[PDB]
Structures are given as structure tokens and as C-alpha cells.
Structure 1
Amino acid sequence: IVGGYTCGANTVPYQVSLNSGYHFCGGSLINSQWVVSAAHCYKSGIQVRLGEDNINVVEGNEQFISASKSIVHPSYNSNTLNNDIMLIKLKSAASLNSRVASISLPTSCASAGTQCLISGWGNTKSSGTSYPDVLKCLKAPILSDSSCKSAYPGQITSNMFCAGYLEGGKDSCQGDSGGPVVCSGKLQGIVSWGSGCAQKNKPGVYTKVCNYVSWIKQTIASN
């Protein structure tokens, strides 16, 4: 997160860190056994870490659970990042508490204008590199589909939306990949891609979770 703020420990109980020896991606808990993330974060040997603030310090609220299974969207295109969504099932079910909690799936698509909260352990600098140990948060509006396509000609499908600031300064960034965009207590987005971070006229691009609710629910019902 560039230009964000320190969330506070466990103030985002649905934020998970994907760890293969190191945090590499964010993710969102949607029930005790399942995480939603970005297809482009797929690798094997994933450990899901819940209850995290500082990812380099054991602080007392962690649950570390190995993934049993990852499932990339049947139609994921790694070139265009179309359908950048993936599900991860835990080997055992998490203990849900006040600091480890699912976020609801949307019952409907959120609109341009809607204020949202984006979070992750990504780079905090727009030029240069600087990874924080504790969780960062960003309040950002969903932008119009027209300004989103203007800003990224020929690259925005119906499975993507922009959120943030055309003036730049504030954004998701590398290492936030796969993590949440929550709007009014529903998960509307997954941190997907963008051109650089926090650049003028180059806002973050997020997978549009509302489009995927059938697939998610159908998938969790049979795995």
C-alpha cells in the first residue's frame, strides 16, 4: 500500500498472508476453510497465515494452516489477467474469532463512488522499495468504468474495475496482490494489477468479485 496508514493489529480479521517461506501474496478468508486470492498468485506449497499484523514477529493471534488445494479460475488468462481469482482450501479449518473472521461475499456489484478499504503488506513507496512488517490500509473509491478504460486502453474487461485516485499518491502495490477490497462489509475486489504504483492516471486494477460468486459458492460446495 502506497500512501496508506497502519491499520492496527487484527483490525482487518479477513486479511491473510500467503507464505511459501516468505509472504508473497495477500488473500481474504471467506469461511473457515477457504481463502480467495489472485490466480496470478498461484504457486504450490502455500501456507496460509491468519491473525497477522507484523508478519516477521509472532505476536499471539496467528493461525498458520497449510493449504490442501488451490483452484485457479477455469478461464484465467495469465497474459491479460482476465479472471484473476483463485480459491485456496486449508488442510484444517481455522478457529474463527474476533481477530480471524470471514468477510461476506457481495450479493451485488458495487458502484463507482463506493468507498472501499484496501489492505496488504506490499511496498509502501511509489518510486523505490520499502516493505512494511505491519499491515497497511487504504480508503479508496471505485472509479467509473469509463475513466478505468481511458486510463488503460484495451486492457479493462468486465471482470475488472479500477479503484483509487487519478491524481496518484495512493494505491495498492507489489506484495498486495491477491488481497482484499472490502466495501460496506462485502468483498468487492481482489488486488490484481496496475502500471507501476500510485502513478498519476494509473490506478489499481482489481478483479470484480461479484462476477464470481456462483463459481465460488459452487466450488466450495463440491471441494
Structure 2
Amino acid sequence: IVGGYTCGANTVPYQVSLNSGYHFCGGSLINSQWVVSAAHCYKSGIQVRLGEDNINVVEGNEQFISASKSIVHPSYNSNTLNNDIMLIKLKSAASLNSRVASISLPTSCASAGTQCLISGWGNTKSSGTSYPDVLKCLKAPILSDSSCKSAYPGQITSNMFCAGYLEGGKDSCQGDSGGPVVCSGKLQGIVSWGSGCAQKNKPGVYTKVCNYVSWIKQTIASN
């Protein structure tokens, strides 16, 4: 997260870190056995880490559970990143409490202007790599479709939305991929891509979760 602030330990209880010997992506806990992340974060050997704050120190509240299966959306296109969503089923259920809690799926899409919270352990520099030890937060608004399409002409599908600041300085960045964009208490986006980090006129692009709610519910119901 570039231009963000320290969230405070366990203030984002649905945030998870996907770990394969190191933190590589974020994700959101939606029920005690399922996590939603981005299809581009897929790999085998994933250990999901819940109740984390400092990812390099065990401090208490952490739950490390291995993933039993990862379901990448069947129509995920790795070249356009359209349908960039993946569901991970955990080997055992997480113990939920106030430090580890699930986030609700939306019942409607959000409108531009809606203010949202984006969080993650990704890079905090737009030029160079500086990964933090603790979770960073950023409040960003959803942008109108014309500003998003004018920023990335021909690269935005109806399953994507832009959120951020055109003046630059604040944005999600690598290491944040797969993580949550929560607005009014609902999971509305997943950190997907952007051109560089915090560059002027290049806002972040997020998977529009309101378009996959029936798919998420049907897929969890059948697995």
C-alpha cells in the first residue's frame, strides 16, 4: 500500500496473508472455511495465515491453516485479468472471534464516490520495493466508469472498477494482490492490477465482486 497508514493489530479481522514460505498475496475470509483472493495469486502449496499483523513475528492470535483446494474462476483470462477471482477452501475451519472474523458479500454493487478500505502487506514505494512487516490501510473512493476507461482505454471489462486517486501518491501495489476493498461493511473488490503504483492518472483496478456473488454461493454450495 503506498500512501497508507498502519491499520493497528487485528483491526481488519477478515484479512488473510497467503504464504508459500513467504507472503505473496492477500485474501478475505468470507466464512470459517473459505477465503476469496485473485486468480492470479494461484499456486500450489498455499498456507493461509489468519489473525496476522506483523507477518515476520508470531505474537499471538495467528491461525495457520493449509488450503485443501483453490478454485480459479473457469473464465479467468491471464492476459486481460478478466474474472480475476479464486476461492480457497481451508483444510479445517478457522476459529472465528473478534480478531479473525468473516466479511459479508454485497447485495448490490457500489457507486462511484463510495469510500472503501483497502489493506495489505504489499510494497509501500511506487519506485523501488519496501515491504512492511505490519498491515497497512488506505481509504480510497470508487471512481466513475468514464475516468476508469479514460485511464486504461480498452482494458477495463464490466467485471472491473477503478478506485484510488488520479493525482497519484496513494494506491495498492504488488504484495497487495488478492486482498480486500471493503465499502460500507461489504467486500466489493479484490486488488487485481494497475500500471505501476501510485502514478498520476493510473488508478488501481479491482475485480467487481458484486458480479460473482451467485457464482461464489453456488460454488461453495457444491464443494
TM-score normalised by L of structure 2: 1.00
How far apart in 1 are the matches of 2:221 and 2:56? 35
Q: Provide structure 1 residue ranges, at least 5 long, that are not aligned to the other structure.
A: none
Where 1:87 maps in the other structure, the secondary structure is strand
* 1:158 positional shift: 0.2
Distance 1:94 1:163 in 2: 31
Q: CA deviation at 1:146?
A: 0.6
How far apart are residue 129 of structure 1 and its match? 1.2
Q: 3-state SS of the aligned residue for 1:124? A: coil
- Which contiguous aligned blocks of 4+ residues in structure 1 show a shift greater than 3 angstroms? none
SS in 2 for 1:108: coil
Please report the RMSD computed on the Cα atoms of aligned residues, expressed in angstroms.
0.3
TM-score (normalised: structure 1): 1.00
In the TM superposition, what whole-angstrom CA distance separates every residue of 1:186-214 from its partner, at most 9, and x where no partner exists? 00000000000000000100000000000
Distance 1:155 1:134 in 2: 33
Aligned residues: 223
For residues 77-134 of structure 1, the C-alpha deviation after alignment (integer angstroms, 9 at most, x for no partner) is 0000000000000000000010000000000000000000000000000111100000
Determine what percentage of the aligned residue pairs are the same residue: 100
Q: Secondary structure at the match of 2:40?
A: helix
3-state DSSP of counterpart to 2:213: helix
Counterpart CA distance in 2 for 1:134 and 1:127 is: 20
Q: Distance in 2 between matches of 1:86 and 1:155?
A: 21
Any idea what SS the aligned residue of 1:40 has?
helix
Please state how far the C-alpha of 1:45 moved relative to its aligned partner: 0.7
Matches within 5 A, 1:6-17: 6-17=6-17
Q: Distance in 1 between matches of 2:96 and 2:222?
A: 22
Whole-Å Cα distance in 1 between the matches of residues 170 and 139 of structure 2? 9
State the distance in 1 between where 2:24 and 2:129 align: 15
Hey, what's the Cα distance between the residues in 2 that align with 1:184 and 1:136? 19
Cα distance per residue 1:12-33 (max 9 Å; x no partner): 0000000001100000000000
